[PDB]
Write a protein that binds this ligand. Structure first.
Ligand code: 60Y
Length: 387
């Protein structure tokens, strides 16, 4: 329906992540928290750090409970270590509830906190299977659903501005909405189409066909989900398995061949700039991902524009961008490139993910992002990877 208290409760941008305000402890300590559908721990800075101006002070919370257990979370780009405990947590622009949740109090970190970023912790919204140290550490959303009458569903509208936001603008701008326990109809246009959650660990999905400007990439569909395909608000790019990335970039280069770009642009390293207002959107192709439908032998497609996969960056008055499609050795990641085009419904209760055209997606007068269906697609379970 309508969840006016939760609409426009996010801030941020794809390169720095999107965050929501939360409170921890008694009296409440306000912190900004990165919204991550790609992990399952609620973890906050709990010790001074040069890039933090606030942190969780456990000794000032009367409701703090020590779990007497450490947690070490190393990952590819960095790591954090901390001490497990529980406390009362609320979301000021959220459901009007307070819950007792697990909190990893971060005491040591490496390349986790970012200078200039305005967030102090991370909210892992995925399932217990991938929580650290193990699946016995109940994730925040699981606690929220168990302790209250909040429906087992949340939805995200991540809003890319379509232009770079400076240090002050990114603080004052609306980055989107996280609707906890519902679907807000003002955030999308057209119909919502649902794809099954394949398995409850990451938000895993199955891609059954890929097109670049309507041209079938024509790969064995297992390649698109090798070794998994996930929906991740904590990844900036659309990341594709090595072989898929190679085929996609060849096709995108062919479609945009009226303009030659350096190898560094396609590697996501180098920016490309055009005179103000002259970005040649029309030379770049649309990209469609077909996802398994809820009905046997049925699929639907989501289509994004170069306004989604060319990330605006500051150089001058030129309009500059980085190519935000990159290679993966851990499967497809539908990051903020995908998510900024759509309103995404994480329907945990019905084990499905919904997509609709976002009311805040960036487009031009000639093309728009799309969510369309149905299409007849056979042997879609064969597209899923095993082992
Ligand atoms: C892609 N991705 C995440 N989705 N989450 C993680 C992080 C994302 C960010 C981050 C920072 C800035 C911008 C963006 C965006 N968009 C994301 C910092 S840490 C957490 N994680 C993880 N893994 C295993 C585990 F038991 C617990 N946490 C893996 C990290 C990661 O590389």
């Amino acid at each position: 329906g309508s969840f006016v208290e939760m609409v426009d409760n996010l801030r941020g941008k794809s390169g720095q992540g999107y965050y929501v305000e939360m409170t921890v402890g008694s009296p409440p300590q306000t912190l900004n928290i990165l919204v991550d559908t790609g992990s399952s721990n609620f973890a906050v800075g709990a010790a001074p750090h040069p890039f933090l101006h606030r942190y969780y002070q456990r000794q000032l919370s009367s409701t703090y409970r020590d779990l007497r257990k450490g947690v070490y979370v190393p990952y590819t780009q960095g790591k954090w270590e901390g001490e497990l405990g529980t406390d009362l947590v609320s979301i000021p622009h959220g459901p009007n509830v307070t819950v007792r949740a697990n909190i990893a109090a971060i005491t040591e970190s490496d390349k986790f906190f970012i200078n200039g970023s305005n967030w102090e912790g991370i909210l892992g919204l995925a399932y217990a299977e991938i929580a650290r140290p193990d699946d016995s550490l109940e994730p925040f959303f699981d606690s929220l659903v168990k302790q209250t009458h909040v429906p087992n569903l949340f939805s995200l509208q991540l809003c890319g501005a379509g232009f770079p936001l400076n240090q002050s603008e990114v603080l004052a701008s609306v980055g989107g909405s996280m609707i906890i326990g519902g679907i807000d109809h003002s955030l999308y246009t057209g119909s919502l189409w649902y794809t099954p959650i394949r398995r409850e660990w990451y938000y895993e999905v199955i891609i059954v066909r890929v097109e670049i400007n309507g041209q079938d990439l024509k790969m064995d569909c297992k390649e698109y989900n090798y070794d998994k395909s996930i929906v991740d608000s904590g990844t900036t790019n659309l990341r594709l398995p090595k072989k898929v990335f190679e085929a996609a970039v060849k096709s995108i280069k062919a479609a945009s061949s009226t303009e030659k770009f350096p190898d560094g642009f396609w590697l996501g390293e180098q920016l490309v700039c055009w005179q103000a207002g002259t970005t040649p959107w029309n030379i770049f192709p649309v990209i469609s991902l077909y996802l398994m439908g809820e009905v046997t032998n049925q699929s639907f497609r989501i289509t994004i524009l170069p306004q989604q996969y060319l990330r605006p960056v500051e150089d001058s008055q030129d309009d500059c961008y980085k190519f935000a499609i990159s290679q993966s050795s851990t499967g497809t990641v539908m990051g903020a490139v995908i998510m900024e085009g759509f309103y995404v419904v994480f329907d945990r209760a019905r084990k499905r993910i919904g997509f609709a055209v976002s009311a805040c997606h960036v487009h031009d007068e000639f093309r728009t992002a799309a969510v369309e269906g149905p299409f007849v697609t056979l042997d879609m379970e064969d597209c899923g990877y095993n082992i």
